[PDB]
Structures are given as C-alpha cells and as structure tokens.
What does this fold into?
Amino acid sequence: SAMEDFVRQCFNPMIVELAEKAMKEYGEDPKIETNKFAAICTHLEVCFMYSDFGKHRFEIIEGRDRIMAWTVVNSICNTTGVEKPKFLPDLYDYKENRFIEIGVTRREVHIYYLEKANKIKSEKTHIHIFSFTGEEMATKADYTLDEESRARIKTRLFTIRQEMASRSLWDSFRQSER
Ligand SMILES: O=C(O)c1[nH]c(-c2ccc(-c3nnn[nH]3)cc2C(F)(F)F)cc(=O)c1O
Ligand SMILES: [Mn+2]
Ligand SMILES: [Mn+2]
It folds into this structure.
C-alpha cells in the first residue's frame, strides 16, 4: 500500500525502525495496520522534536525499550524525588521538574486531552496535546516550549497531514483513531 510507502518517504529511518519495533512488540504488523504505523511515526517524531528543542532540558523516555525506559524513570524519581508515574510517560522536564505526556490527535484537542487526563489521573504528569490543525492544549495552559518550537511542531504535523492528503490517505488516517 501507499501508506507504508509514504511513512518510509517522510520519516527518518531511525523513527521508522522504532515504530516498527513498537508494532512488532504487541504483534501488530505495519503492512496491515498502516494507519497505526503512521500514527506511531508521527508521535515518535513529535516527542523527539520536543526534547530536541531543549544543558539538556528534556529527557526522552518514549521510544526506549520498556526496561531502559523504566530504568530512566526510576533514576529520575530517586534523584529528584518526583512521584513515580503509573504509565511510562514521554518526557521528563528538568527545568520544570515534571514528566510530560505528549498527545497527537486527529480529533478535537480537548476530546483527546480529557481522554489522556482521565487515563493518567496523576496530577503530577504534564499533558501537551497537538493536532494536525495547528491547535494545542496543555495542562494549566503551560505550553512549556517557546512559540517558535511549538510552531515548528505544528507546522510539521500540518505538513504530514497535507502529504497524506495529496496521496489521498488523509480521510482514512483521520477516521482511524485519536
Ligand atoms: O505507548 C505509548 O507510550 C503511547 N502510545 C500511543 C498510541 C496508542 C494507540 C494507537 C492506535 N492507533 N490506532 N490504534 N491504536 C497509536 C498510538 C501512537 F500515537 F503511538 F501511535 C499514544 C501516546 O501518546 C503514547 O504515549
Ligand atoms: Mn508514550
Ligand atoms: Mn504520548
């Protein structure tokens, strides 16, 4: 199909390998679940851009194998005393000293935000939701990043959506899930 062709066109080889490993973990196949494959790449890329926009302000938990990722979280918790989250989060902010959960949605940002908040119900983990329409939503409206960084992210997301559209993959992608 053209969805896996596109993923391999637009996402750098590391991100693809990581999303393919993520899929192969629970038995999902990128050549069948092509929309989940695109979503995995996209969210991986946003996480990586987020941490790259920060002396390293952000520690990236997402994309690591569960063993390594928990090791990183447990370390952060012992040295900072921060509360240990129930679900492995996406980033750690050393400036604000808080974990972050990153969401990327094809739906309304507040729908997905409520979904994530209710999922985590840990007051300590910060939530930042991005859409493919240049919208964001974030705990207490603390967007963590400066305007240019969040614009770089919004732009890339919009660009993925528009590349899917030029290839006629957008309507399938947006009706698929989050
Ligand atoms: O594993 C994580 O940590 C994680 N997993 C997801 C996620 C969950 C379900 C689907 C899906 N799509 N269609 N069926 N299921 C896709 C994703 C993806 F965004 F990673 F692609 C979102 C997070 O934000 C997150 O942090
Ligand atoms: Mn995650
Ligand atoms: Mn996430």
The pocket of IJM (ligand 1) is lined by residues 36, 39-40, 43, 62, 90, 102-103, 176-177 (CB under 6 Å).
